[PDB]
Amino acid sequence: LIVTQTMKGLDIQKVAGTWYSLAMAASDISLL
Amino acid sequence: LIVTQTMKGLDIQKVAGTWYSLAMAASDISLL
Amino acid sequence: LIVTQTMKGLDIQKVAGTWYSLAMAASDISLL
Amino acid sequence: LIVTQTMKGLDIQKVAGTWYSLAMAASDISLL
Amino acid sequence: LIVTQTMKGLDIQKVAGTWYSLAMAASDISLL
Amino acid sequence: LIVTQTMKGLDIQKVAGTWYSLAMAASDISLL
């Protein structure tokens, strides 16, 4: 398993909330 | 398994909410 | 398992909230 | 005279040439 | 005369050339 | 004359060339 996540030139503004993650990677993920 | 996620030139604004992830990758994912 | 997360040129402003992580990586993750 | 030029989320690549200006503003401009 | 030039989240790559200016502002400009 | 040039979150790479200026401002400019 290879993960390559690149981000360039991002503008984020007024994100009032519950921002968890911009980039996420794992072997296993789950949400309930 | 190879994952290559690239993002360039993004503008995000007024995302009031519950933003989990912009980019996500895993072996296994599930939601309930 | 290989994870390579790179970010370049980011502007974040007015993120009043509960910002957990910009970049996240693990073997296992879960949320309830 | 008011000038407001905003740019967000730009990706420029392989611009081999004679790139003068991305954003330009003036009172007077001319080219010959 | 008011000039407001803002740039956010820019990715520029492989610009082999004669890049003069990204953002330009003046009272008078000319090229010959 | 008022000039306000702001740049945030910039990625520039492999700009082999003759890069003059990212941001430029003056009363008078000319090129020949």
Curated annotation (Swiss-Prot), chains A, B, C, D, E, F:
Tissues/organs with expression? Synthesized in mammary gland and secreted in milk.
* Maturation and modification: Alternate disulfide bonds occur in equal amounts in all variants examined.
Locations listed in the record: Secreted
Homology family: Belongs to the calycin superfamily. Lipocalin family.
Record note on quaternary structure: Under physiological conditions beta-lactoglobulin exists as an equilibrium mixture of monomeric and dimeric forms. Interaction with LMBR1L which mediates the endocytosis of LGB has been observed in PubMed:17991420, but not in PubMed:23964685.
Q: What does this protein do?
A: Primary component of whey, it binds retinol and is probably involved in the transport of that molecule.
Q: What is this protein called?
A: Beta-lactoglobulin
Name the species this protein comes from. Answer: Bos taurus (Bovine)
Q: Which residues of the full protein are shown?
A: 17 to 48 of 178
